[PDB]
Amino acid sequence: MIPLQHGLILAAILFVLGLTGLVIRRNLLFMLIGLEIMINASALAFVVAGSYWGQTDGQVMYILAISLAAAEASIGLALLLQLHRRRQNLNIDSVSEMRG
Amino acid sequence: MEFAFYICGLIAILATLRVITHTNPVHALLYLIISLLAISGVFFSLGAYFAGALEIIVYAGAIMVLFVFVVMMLNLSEIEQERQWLKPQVWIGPAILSAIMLVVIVYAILGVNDQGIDGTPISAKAVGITLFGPYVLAVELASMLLLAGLVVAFHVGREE
Amino acid sequence: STEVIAHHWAFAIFLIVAIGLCCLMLVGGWFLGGRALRLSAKFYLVAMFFVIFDVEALYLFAWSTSIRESGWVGFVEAAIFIFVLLAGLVYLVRIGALDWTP
Amino acid sequence: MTITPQNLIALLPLLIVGLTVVVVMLSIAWRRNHFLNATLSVIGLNAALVSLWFVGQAGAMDVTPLMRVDGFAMLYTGLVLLASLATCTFAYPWLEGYNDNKDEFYLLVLIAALGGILLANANHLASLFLGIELISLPLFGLVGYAFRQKRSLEASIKYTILSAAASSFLLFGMALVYAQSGDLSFVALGKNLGDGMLNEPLLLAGFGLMIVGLGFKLSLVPFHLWTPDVYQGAPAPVSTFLATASKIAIFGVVMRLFLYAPVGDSEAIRVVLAIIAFASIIFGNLMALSQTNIKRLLGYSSISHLGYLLVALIALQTGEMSMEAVGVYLAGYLFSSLGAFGVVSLMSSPYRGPDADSLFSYRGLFWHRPILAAVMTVMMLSLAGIPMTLGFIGKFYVLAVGVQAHLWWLVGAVVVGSAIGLYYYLRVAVSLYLHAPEQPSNWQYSAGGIVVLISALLVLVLGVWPQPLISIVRLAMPLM
Amino acid sequence: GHPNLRRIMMPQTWKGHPLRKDYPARATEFSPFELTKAKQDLEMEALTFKPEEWGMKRDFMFLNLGPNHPSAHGAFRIVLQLDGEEIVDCVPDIGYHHRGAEKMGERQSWHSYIPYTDRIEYLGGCVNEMPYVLAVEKLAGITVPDRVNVIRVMLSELFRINSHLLYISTFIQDVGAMTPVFFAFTDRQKIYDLVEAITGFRMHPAWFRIGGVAHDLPRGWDRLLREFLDWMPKRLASYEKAALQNTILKGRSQGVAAYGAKEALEWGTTGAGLRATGIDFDVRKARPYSGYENF
Amino acid sequence: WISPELIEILLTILKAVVILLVVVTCGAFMSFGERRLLGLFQNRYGPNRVGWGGSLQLVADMIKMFFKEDWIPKFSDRVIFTLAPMIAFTSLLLAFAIVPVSPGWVVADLNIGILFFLMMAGLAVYAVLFAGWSSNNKYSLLGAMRASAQTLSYEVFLGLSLMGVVAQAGSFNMTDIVNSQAHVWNVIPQFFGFITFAIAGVAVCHRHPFDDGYHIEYSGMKFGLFFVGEYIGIVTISALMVTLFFGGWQGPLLPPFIWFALKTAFFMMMFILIRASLPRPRYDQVMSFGWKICLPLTLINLLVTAAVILWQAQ
Ligand SMILES: CCCCCCCCCCCCCCCCCC(=O)OC[C@H](COP(=O)(O)OCCN)OC(=O)CCCCCCCCCCCCCCCCC
Ligand SMILES: CCCCCCCCCCCCCCCCCC(=O)OC[C@H](COP(=O)(O)OCCN)OC(=O)CCCCCCCCCCCCCCCCC
Ligand SMILES: CCCCCCCCCCCCCCCCCCCC
Ligand SMILES: CCCCCCCCCCCCCCCCCCCC
Ligand SMILES: CCCCCCCCCCCCCCCCCCCC
Structure with a gap:
């Protein structure tokens, strides 16, 4: 008696909020934060879908989603550390040299 | 169980909205931790007990710990002195685009058959049964994915 | 059931009273009483290792509660998982990733 | 379900590449030896390639509720393994000039090849997602392997951010698809729909988000803007792997998804894929008109060739020879891209420091590197679809498949894009054979030269005599 | 040719040279202005730190350990140059505990300066009184009798045991074990009972005189000495087996700040460090004094 | 309104409130008890002059910390500064919220249990980090990152x-779990699990010998919240291993309940003796012991446990 539509709507709201944070912020740290928000929203959507059908598949896909999320957070934060080490700023618009 | 789900969803939405509009990185990470706790409450309201447990243990206990560690490393610096994302000429366009995509996805959601989520609690025993049953290779190649992330992050995140 | 809703109310009251106790303690502390550098990347490395091995730990958490229902083939699968985990740990130790000292 | 010993026999390349990952891991843990670790990696990849024969003698059936092993999976596993072996061969002389740790490169290549094998054998949304991540994250490491270099770090940041965004889009798409259908297997996507109600709104939305993620992964317009930057900034063997193996594996799993899912026959998805293929062909050819750099030109080339592949994929439900066309085209594209990116890698090896430019300067290459120039112009003629080359055979297959399914807009797109490709590819060839103002000695460099030479010989021989390739592709027939 | 000829006892903003004969020895009138100025200097010291006036050179962090230190050896400041955890360079800021004892030597009589000699190092007491009174007896032409030598050796060895118990306890507490300092302070209380009985004071007895000691030994001191001699060895064995044989303590201690005989000789290092470098040079044996040859 | 369902609701609520009050009072009473037992271990008395046996020393300390001047640093983040002792208290309190002290006496009979304890530890690390960052001091920040790296190194195998x-x-x-020990307590088969969990529980509580301090800027009643939070963590870890x-x-x-209280009291006294007896290892030694010995020991212990269980399964 909790609708699947409401859970999917909540996950979609969090996904588009994470996408908005990923786009509008020039800071690479806030871009990684937005990426974490989007992948957590997708994992929440999988949990909602699995709970609607009464299957463990949603939680299995949640586990795979957070394994991916942890690994990409590690890789992105290492890249952010290298960028801050060799540029002393996190402005992602500064790294735009290759073009055309 | 309905009330807990809706209040946790509302808290997660408000906390994410405060995350993507804040200036202080530690404050943004704190509202992100609050949003992760709220989404874990959503998971617990839907009977996904293992998913909410992992949401606090791993997502809100390891990943955002790593984010907080890196933010303390940076000692965050030409960020609050700009505030460019709150000027409308930067954020109106992407907000319009995200609103359009949200409208399209919500319209697609509203045209589905719904029998309602009964919220029957799915334990971690069943998740472990199906994890080492139908999804053996998922576990093994996810170990390899974590290994790949470990090797990549060690190779990049050094100092020499 | 009545027992499960009693336990739910007990847990809710526990959480609320604990939050109220610490908040009232801080409020009473505030109210009463008159008035008058660049870190080394080993921190990121150890936190990253904790994150990765905590995800591997979550996989083992899921395995451990259903060992009997998985049988011996589940033991073989988890042994392969643990062997890959230990190979990664040996790899990390041997290249000095886990050596805080230089 | 349970796993039989026959299932383990059918999973032989997966187990062999994973055991190679573990063995190379423990060998690096023992002692950092570049030659020994590279040798162990190529030995494991060759062992998987020759265990494909035992997989063929095993049969074609369902190893997991997640994997299905058939001749399609064998062919795509072979292409991925060949691309990974060529990546290691080009990578050794480039890594010989690398001053930091070299051994992690082959570990990342092995894990990416494991993800490619996963995508080749994938029969499940979970397997598709895990294979995409298992490909992408070693590519995150490899694209920014020379992270001290500014362009490589920039390409790594761009690829990591955009691929995490595409993974989130794809994951949300599978979440909506699972919410609709209730099963994550490929055969059960839209199976519960009936009476002409195949165009379910939530199922179409989930498939659209998955199309967004996969079209990022396949460099399709308008998720294509990352491709020339990431191709240019990455190391040249990494660009070889990213152009060949990732594209091949992701297109193979997309082919499986659209072949097995009953919603793959939807008219709306077909029209959306037609628009994406048209825009991809035209845009990828148009952006490469004025490209001086060879890496960006090859990135736009990858966009156009994936558009031709998408054109072949649209006619999957109409003609039964669409899988034949995709296999022949992918073999030809693999060999041509291997030759071109191997010429780039051999002229970019050894790595001459992070603070120096990695410009190619292909002008006047024949007067000091004649065999490399001959191979490179053979590859440029092959990518143009000019006869006597295997790329022409693939483009002929694409045109035949488009004609059989009456995709006339796509046929005109292929013709126009082929003309534009003729312009810039012949420009590269004559620039090779012009004169230059100004401007090895080990057996691994010679091995890379041998690899690009056999690639050129295969392109020419199978351009004038394609029937063995046709027969081996017809042997790679999946489950019905 | 000195590298950094800067002041080491007085602050850098000090006028005059205190050990000169025309320098006034007594304390100047206190002023809150100078205290406020020096507080402001201490506040802006971290803001305007220049690592060139301190004798240093050149990701290199700079840190200050002191000036206040939560330990029993005093309060002094160390400026540390750090590469991560590694120490690249370090200079000590000393002179924070400068009492002007030599200038007081120029201001007291020969007899009334003995209490000042007590407070040179305050764990030693009569050990600190001994070289001063022996030098004054050299100036006076005094050959003290044998009982004087034996009494002074007694008190010097008692205070040596007191100081060594303090040192071992402080080292163990710095490693991290917290109980042996309590037990060895009980042992120090036993020593202080004997010293209080003999001299009348605990840690600054000022009991040595030019030509002897202030009083005779009180009747009954041998009972207290026998009690302490029966008390000590079991407690010392307990300290060894409880903390000094602990492998964690050995890991924290062994191989830490090692040097050979050449470094000990070139730096003037004497005492336990010089003898730990293998050089058998003790004053009580090489150049005997106060009848130490009879023990 | 007199109904037996409402009577059972109030009885369970009262039992949970009683358990909460008893565990908080126990944490404070054995702050005083640690002072007394350290005195006992160090051949002295400790506080025994404020009331009978010193039992009113805690009340005097409570009043003193209440009426101490509340001071927040001027250039600090006020919300994070207030939030760090908040978490350091409530995290291990809610960790205790799943401990069964008697048949029928349990606050939350959750299906997750020690998973909830793991969540609470993953918030206690936030408490330490927030205390370090909010102090606006670089020495406190470095000490907090070192302490949080240590607690991550031991939370990785808790x-x-x-x-x-x-x-x-x-x-x-x-x-x-307590019903599966009807014949033999789990310390006998899971001995390596016992020693690893004891080491990890001591380390994640930041107790001796696993302890530029990050509490130097904290004063007033916030320091008291930190103190009682650490002591509640000691009580919680002791009850959990019991x-x-x-x-x-x-x-x-x-x-x-008498058996539970006696075993918990013995383990808390073992905490006191562990503080009084062992010296502090070096930081690199501590993390190397956590990463190179204890984590493989837990993995091998889990493999051996699974093999033993599946052998016994007929
Ligand atoms: C810029 C260069 C590139 C130019 C664009 C690329 C080529 C575009 C070709 C456009 C073709 C338009 C066809 C329009 C009708 C389609 C629907 C139809 O009615 O088809 C009839 C028929 C299918 O029906 P069926 O029952 O099979 O009848 C058998 C007929 N004997 O159909 C068939 O049986 C097959 C019909 C095939 C028609 C010929 C296709 C190729 C013709 C040569 C190239 C185009 C014309 C020359 C160039 C024009 C200017 C560039
Ligand atoms: C709720 C109640 C809980 C109460 C507490 C109960 C459990 C207490 C757990 C305490 C854990 C302390 C762990 C300390 C680990 C130190 C590891 C280490 O590196 O030690 C350094 C030392 C020398 O190592 P090395 O590498 O040689 O260094 C030389 C370099 N110069 O290496 C060594 O000396 C090697 C040995 C290290 C320590 C091994 C484990 C000792 C555990 C403590 C004693 C437990 C006694 C029994 C307790 C009751 C049981 C019922
Ligand atoms: C210095 C360079 C900065 C580049 C910033 C790029 C920001 C792009 C924002 C795009 C906003 C689009 C708004 C909606 C457009 C209409 C709807 C989509 C097309 C139908
Ligand atoms: C049509 C399929 C491909 C056929 C072969 C294409 C060419 C391959 C290379 C052959 C050797 C080229 C030698 C060119 C010499 C030019 C000398 C110019 C002198 C001014
Ligand atoms: C350190 C111990 C903390 C314990 C917290 C919970 C205390 C609960 C007290 C319950 C008392 C009654 C238990 C059931 C009856 C059996 C015992 C009767 C005699 C006390």
Whole structure:
């Protein structure tokens, strides 16, 4: 008696909020934060879908989603550390040299 | 169980909205931790007990710990002195685009058959049964994915 | 059931009273009483290792509660998982990733 | 379900590449030896390639509720393994000039090849997602392997951010698809729909988000803007792997998804894929008109060739020879891209420091590197679809498949894009054979030269005599 | 040719040279202005730190350990140059505990300066009184009798045991074990009972005189000495087996700040460090004094 | 309004409130008890002049910390500064919220249990980090990153040390865990799990010998919240290892709550003796011991436990 539509709507709201944070912020740290928000929203959507059908598949896909999320957070934060080490700023618009 | 789900969803939405509009990185990470706790409450309201447990243990206990560690490393610096994302000429366009995509996805959601989520609690025993049953290779190649992330992050995140 | 809703109310009251106790303690502390550098990347490395091995730990958490229902083939699968985990740990130790000292 | 010993026999390349990952891991843990670790990696990849024969003698059936092993999976596993072996061969002389740790490169290549094998054998949304991540994250490491270099770090940041965004889009798409259908297997996507109600709104939305993620992964317009930057900034063997193996594996799993899912026959998805293929062909050819750099030109080339592949994929439900066309085209594209990116890698090896430019300067290459120039112009003629080359055979297959399914807009797109490709590819060839103002000695460099030479010989021989390739592709027939 | 000829006892903003004969020895009138100025200097010291006036050179962090230190050896400041955890360079800021004892030597009589000699190092007491009174007896032409030598050796060895118990306890507490300092302070209380009985004071007895000691030994001191001699060895064995044989303590201690005989000789290092470098040079044996040859 | 369902609701609520008050009072009373027992170990008395036996020393300390001038640093983040002792208290309090002290006396009979304890540890690390960052001091920040790196190095195998007990019980529930020890307590089969969980529990509580301090800017009643939070963490870890490795409330003769209280008291006294006895290892030695010895020990223990269980399965 909790609708699947409401859970999917909540996950979609969090996904588009994470996408908005990923786009509008020039800071690479806030871009990684937005990426974490989007992948957590997708994992929440999988949990909602699995709970609607009464299957463990949603939680299995949640586990795979957070394994991916942890690994990409590690890789992105290492890249952010290298960028801050060799540029002393996190402005992602500064790294735009290759073009055309 | 309905009330807990809706209040946790509302808290997660408000906390994410405060995350993507804040200036202080530690404050943004704190509202992100609050949003992760709220989404874990959503998971617990839907009977996904293992998913909410992992949401606090791993997502809100390891990943955002790593984010907080890196933010303390940076000692965050030409960020609050700009505030460019709150000027409308930067954020109106992407907000319009995200609103359009949200409208399209919500319209697609509203045209589905719904029998309602009964919220029957799915334990971690069943998740472990199906994890080492139908999804053996998922576990093994996810170990390899974590290994790949470990090797990549060690190779990049050094100092020499 | 009545027992499960009693336990739910007990847990809710526990959480609320604990939050109220610490908040009232801080409020009473505030109210009463008159008035008058660049870190080394080993921190990121150890936190990253904790994150990765905590995800591997979550996989083992899921395995451990259903060992009997998985049988011996589940033991073989988890042994392969643990062997890959230990190979990664040996790899990390041997290249000095886990050596805080230089 | 349970796993039989026959299932383990059918999973032989997966187990062999994973055991190679573990063995190379423990060998690096023992002692950092570049030659020994590279040798162990190529030995494991060759062992998987020759265990494909035992997989063929095993049969074609369902190893997991997640994997299905058939001749399609064998062919795509072979292409991925060949691309990974060529990546290691080009990578050794480039890594010989690398001053930091070299051994992690082959570990990342092995894990990416494991993800490619996963995508080749994938029969499940979970397997598709895990294979995409298992490909992408070693590519995150490899694209920014020379992270001290500014362009490589920039390409790594761009690829990591955009691929995490595409993974989130794809994951949300599978979440909506699972919410609709209730099963994550490929055969059960839209199976519960009936009476002409195949165009379910939530199922179409989930498939659209998955199309967004996969079209990022396949460099399709308008998720294509990352491709020339990431191709240019990455190391040249990494660009070889990213152009060949990732594209091949992701297109193979997309082919499986659209072949097995009953919603793959939807008219709306077909029209959306037609628009994406048209825009991809035209845009990828148009952006490469004025490209001086060879890496960006090859990135736009990858966009156009994936558009031709998408054109072949649209006619999957109409003609039964669409899988034949995709296999022949992918073999030809693999060999041509291997030759071109191997010429780039051999002229970019050894790595001459992070603070120096990695410009190619292909002008006047024949007067000091004649065999490399001959191979490179053979590859440029092959990518143009000019006869006597295997790329022409693939483009002929694409045109035949488009004609059989009456995709006339796509046929005109292929013709126009082929003309534009003729312009810039012949420009590269004559620039090779012009004169230059100004401007090895080990057996691994010679091995890379041998690899690009056999690639050129295969392109020419199978351009004038394609029937063995046709027969081996017809042997790679999946489950019905 | 000195590298950094800067002041080491007085602050850098000090006028005059205190050990000169025309320098006034007594304390100047206190002023809150100078205290406020020096507080402001201490506040802006971290803001305007220049690592060139301190004798240093050149990701290199700079840190200050002191000036206040939560330990029993005093309060002094160390400026540390750090590469991560590694120490690249370090200079000590000393002179924070400068009492002007030599200038007081120029201001007291020969007899009334003995209490000042007590407070040179305050764990030693009569050990600190001994070289001063022996030098004054050299100036006076005094050959003290044998009982004087034996009494002074007694008190010097008692205070040596007191100081060594303090040192071992402080080292163990710095490693991290917290109980042996309590037990060895009980042992120090036993020593202080004997010293209080003999001299009348605990840690600054000022009991040595030019030509002897202030009083005779009180009747009954041998009972207290026998009690302490029966008390000590079991407690010392307990300290060894409880903390000094602990492998964690050995890991924290062994191989830490090692040097050979050449470094000990070139730096003037004497005492336990010089003898730990293998050089058998003790004053009580090489150049005997106060009848130490009879023990 | 007199109905037996409402009577049972109020009885369970009253039992939970009683458990909460008893565990908080126990944490404070053995702050004073640590002072007294350190005096006992160090051949002295400790505080025994404020009331009978010193029992009113805690009340005097409570009043003194209440009426101390409340001081927040001027250039600090006020919300994070207030939030760090908040978490350091409530995290391990809610960790205690799943401990069964008697048959029928449990606040939350959750299906997750030690998973909830792991969540609470993953918030205690936030408490330490927030205390370090909010102080606006670089020495406190460096000390906090070192302490949080240590607690991550031991939190990485806390759960895997508990997984042997979980595997033997076959469930995450704490009552199932204490019912699976009906014949033999889990300390006998899961001995390596016992030593690894004891080491990890001492380390994640930042107790001796696993302790530029990050509490120097904290004063008034916030320092008291930190103190009682650490002591509540000691009580929680002791009760958890009593329930997980030592049967919990199971005993032959004495009543079950008496057995639980005696075992918990022995383990808390073992904490006091551990502080009084061992010296501090170096930081690199501590992390190398956590990463190179204890984590493989937990993994091998889990493998051996699974092999033993599947051998016994007919
Ligand atoms: C810029 C260069 C590139 C130019 C664009 C690329 C080529 C575009 C070709 C456009 C073709 C338009 C066809 C329009 C009708 C389609 C629907 C139809 O009615 O088809 C009839 C028929 C299918 O029906 P069926 O029952 O099979 O009848 C058998 C007929 N004997 O159909 C068939 O049986 C097959 C019909 C095939 C028609 C010929 C296709 C190729 C013709 C040569 C190239 C185009 C014309 C020359 C160039 C124009 C200017 C560039
Ligand atoms: C709720 C109640 C809980 C109460 C507490 C109960 C459990 C207490 C757990 C305490 C854990 C302390 C762990 C300390 C680990 C130190 C590891 C280490 O690196 O030690 C350094 C030392 C030398 O190592 P090395 O590498 O040789 O260094 C030389 C370099 N110069 O290496 C060594 O000396 C090697 C040995 C290290 C320590 C091994 C484990 C000792 C555990 C403590 C004693 C437990 C006694 C029994 C307790 C009761 C049991 C019922
Ligand atoms: C210095 C360079 C900065 C580049 C910033 C790029 C920001 C792009 C924002 C795009 C906003 C689009 C708004 C909606 C457009 C209409 C709807 C989509 C097309 C139908
Ligand atoms: C049509 C398929 C491909 C056929 C072969 C294409 C060419 C391959 C290279 C052959 C050797 C080229 C030698 C060119 C010499 C030019 C000398 C110019 C002198 C001014
Ligand atoms: C350190 C111990 C903390 C314990 C917290 C919970 C206390 C609960 C007290 C319950 C008392 C009654 C138990 C059931 C009856 C059996 C025992 C009767 C004699 C006390």
